[PDB]
């Protein structure tokens, strides 16, 4: 996702700049993002440790990676198995992580997703730029018709001279 | 510029942070420097003993994410419609250029 | 025209001002959340009391220290001028018939530690054990006999 | 004046198809992200696997 942010700030002096972002212009991969981090979240838990503070898994402090540590992790770990059971699986039928994650994926596969609205209202966007180009084709077209005229009309001037 | 000899109180949630008052607010020393005073006149500090009820502080954090990123798709959608404008703009232009 | 070519520029590093207030809301969404995570495991940390107060009271001054750090070093990068946490500041974009209507942005104070999450602590304050009469350390003191009457 | 009409007209709005695509293979991109995403759930949601005692 971090990978995904491309950006080239230019100050008033230079010139526009040709190159732009692959994903600028469009808000909806950075929802996504937002809902999952959020999602990451687990309130959700049976256990009174609804966060995942006791086992130890720590996000960095200016990105989303998680600064896992490993001692503490283990530690943790070896004291007790069944908080982490308790932790993020929870009852296991309905509460848990996996299963809010599943069930949201499989929205989005489907027509009613927003990822799946996102590209069906891209690929109509370029249709409608493809209508454009075709019109703007045709008027290249009919300018360039004009100026073949032209250029054969100054050659048979010429030819006449 | 001038520092003052003045009576400090107790700061942080140990209380050991020795929070210089100046006149009549509490500013951390520890952050005092290195701040520029221009822009915040009366920054707040953590106050005398603790702020209890963190419920609604996590409330009001989720908040200001809530409204950072509504923030976020409003200049997102902004600068959209600028840059379509300004596109939209530039080809009629030098349609009409070439037209001409 | 010749202001035709300066309001495109114009518009043009409005617009990449736009973008650059685009991404720099995305990097301090990411520290917030980050910070709120951090600030709901010491709070979820705390509510148990079998561990130690002085390691969750580190904790929460540890907390404290980075989240100013994060603060102020997202209050000094400051590059064409544009910055919410630090300072009020009103953008418009010209009209210069580019533009069918003119938008103005408000960019003003936000920052999170006008909601007190600082001034939290995890510890009520307990009172300290006093010893009367410990008679320990001394004072410094340069008086002298005076100069007359020893003189 | 060829020149000149000529390299106005070849890219006029080329750009916008060219980002549509990438935003398409961005899609893509992260379709997969969240299908590795769906191998790793159906790895862990296993209840049974935290009662290993080998």
Same mark, same amino acid.
């Given at each position: 996702?971090?990978?995904?942010?491309?950006?080239?700030?230019?100050?008033?002096?230079?010139?526009?700049?040709?190159?732009?972002?692959?994903?600028?212009? *469009?808000?909806?991969?950075?929802?996504?993002?937002?809902?999952?981090?959020?999602?990451?979240?687990?309130?959700? =838990?049976?256990?009174?440790?609804?966060?995942?503070?006791?086992?130890?898994?720590?996000?960095?402090?200016?990105?989303?990676?998680?600064?896992?540590?490993?001692?503490?992790?283990? #530690?943790?770990?070896?004291?007790?198995?069944?908080?982490?059971?308790?932790?993020?699986?929870?009852?296991?039928?309905?509460?848990?992580?996996?299963?809010?994650?599943?069930?949201?994926?499989?929205?989005?596969?489907?027509?009613?997703?927003?990822?799946?609205?996102?590209?069906?209202?891209? @690929?109509?966007? /370029?249709?409608? /730029?493809?209508?454009?180009?075709?019109?703007?084709?045709?008027?290249?077209?009919?300018?360039?018709?004009?100026?073949?005229?032209?250029?054969?009309?100054?050659?048979?001037?010429? =030819?006449?001279? | 510029?001038?520092?003052?000899?003045?009576?400090?109180?107790?700061?942080?949630?140990?209380?050991?942070?020795?929070?210089?008052?100046?006149?009549?607010?509490?500013?951390?020393?520890?952050?005092?420097?290195?701040?520029?005073? #221009?822009?915040?006149?009366?920054?707040?500090?953590?106050?005398?003993?603790?702020?209890?009820?963190?419920?609604?502080?996590?409330?009001?954090?989720?908040?200001?994410?809530?409204?950072?990123?509504?923030?976020?798709?409003?200049?997102?959608?902004?600068?959209?419609?600028?840059?379509?404008? /300004?596109?939209?703009?530039? @080809?009629?232009?030098?349609?009409?250029?070439?037209?001409? | 025209?010749?202001? @035709?070519? #300066?309001?495109?520029?114009?518009?043009?590093?409005?617009?990449?001002?736009?973008?650059?207030?685009?991404?720099?809301?995305?990097?301090?969404?990411?520290?917030?959340?980050?910070?709120?995570?951090?600030?709901?495991?010491?709070?979820?940390?705390?509510?148990?009391?079998?561990?130690?107060?002085?390691?969750?009271?580190?904790?929460?001054?540890?907390?404290?220290?980075?989240?100013?750090?994060?603060?102020?070093?997202?209050?000094?990068?400051?590059?064409?001028?544009?910055?919410?946490?630090?300072?009020?500041?009103?953008?418009?974009?010209?009209?210069?018939?580019?533009?069918?209507?003119?938008?103005?942005?408000?960019?003003?104070?936000?920052?999170?530690?006008?909601?007190?999450?600082?001034?939290?602590?995890?510890?009520? #304050?307990?009172?300290?054990?006093?010893?009367?009469?410990?008679?320990?350390?001394?004072? *410094?003191?340069?008086?002298?006999?005076?100069?007359?009457?020893?003189? | 004046?060829?020149?000149?009409?000529?390299?106005?007209?070849?890219?006029?709005?080329?750009?916008?198809?060219?980002?549509?695509?990438?935003?398409?293979?961005?899609?893509?991109? /992260?379709?997969?992200?969240?299908?590795?995403?769906?191998?790793?759930?159906?790895?862990?949601?296993?209840?049974?696997?935290?009662?290993?005692?080998?």
């Amino acid at each position: 996702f971090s990978s995904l942010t491309k950006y080239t700030a230019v100050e008033p002096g230079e010139e526009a700049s040709d190159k732009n972002g692959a994903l600028l212009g *469009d808000s909806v991969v950075r929802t996504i993002q937002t809902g999952i981090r959020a999602q990451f979240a687990n309130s959700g =838990s049976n256990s009174a440790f609804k966060t995942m503070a006791e086992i130890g898994i720590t996000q960095d402090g200016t990105s989303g990676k998680l600064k896992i540590d490993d001692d503490k992790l283990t #530690k943790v770990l070896k004291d007790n198995t069944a908080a982490a059971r308790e932790l993020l699986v929870g009852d296991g039928k309905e509460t848990g992580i996996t299963t809010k994650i599943a069930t949201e994926v499989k929205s989005y596969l489907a027509d009613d997703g927003i990822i799946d609205n996102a590209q069906d209202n891209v @690929n109509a966007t /370029l249709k409608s /730029l493809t209508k454009q180009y075709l019109s703007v084709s045709n008027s290249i077209d009919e300018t360039v018709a004009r100026y073949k005229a032209q250029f054969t009309q100054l050659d048979t001037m010429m =030819s006449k001279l | 510029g001038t520092s003052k000899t003045a009576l400090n109180k107790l700061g942080g949630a140990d209380g050991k942070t020795e929070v210089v008052s100046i006149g009549g607010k509490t500013y951390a020393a520890s952050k005092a420097e290195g701040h520029n005073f #221009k822009a915040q006149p009366d920054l707040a500090e953590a106050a005398a003993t603790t702020t209890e009820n963190p419920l609604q502080k996590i409330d009001a954090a989720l908040a200001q994410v809530d409204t950072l990123r509504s923030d976020l798709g409003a200049v997102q959608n902004r600068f959209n419609s600028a840059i379509t404008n /300004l596109g939209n703009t530039v @080809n009629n232009l030098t349609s009409a250029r070439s037209r001409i | 025209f010749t202001a @035709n070519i #300066k309001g495109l520029t114009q518009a043009s590093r409005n617009a990449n001002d736009g973008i650059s207030i685009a991404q720099t809301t995305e990097g301090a969404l990411n520290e917030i959340n980050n910070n709120l995570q951090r600030v709901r495991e010491l709070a979820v940390q705390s509510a148990n009391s079998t561990n130690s107060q002085s390691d969750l009271d580190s904790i929460q001054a540890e907390i404290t220290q980075r989240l100013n750090e994060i603060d102020r070093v997202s209050g000094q990068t400051q590059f064409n001028g544009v910055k919410v946490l630090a300072q009020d500041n009103t953008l418009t974009i010209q009209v210069g018939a580019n533009d069918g209507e003119t938008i103005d942005i408000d960019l003003k104070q936000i920052n999170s530690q006008t909601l007190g999450l600082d001034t939290l602590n995890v510890q009520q #304050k307990y009172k300290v054990s006093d010893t009367a009469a410990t008679v320990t350390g001394y004072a *410094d003191t340069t008086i002298a006999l005076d100069n007359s009457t020893f003189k | 004046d060829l020149t000149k009409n000529e390299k106005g007209r070849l890219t006029p709005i080329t750009k916008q198809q060219s980002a549509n695509s990438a935003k398409l293979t961005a899609y893509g991109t /992260l379709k997969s992200a969240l299908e590795k995403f769906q191998t790793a759930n159906t790895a862990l949601n296993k209840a049974d696997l935290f009662k290993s005692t080998v």
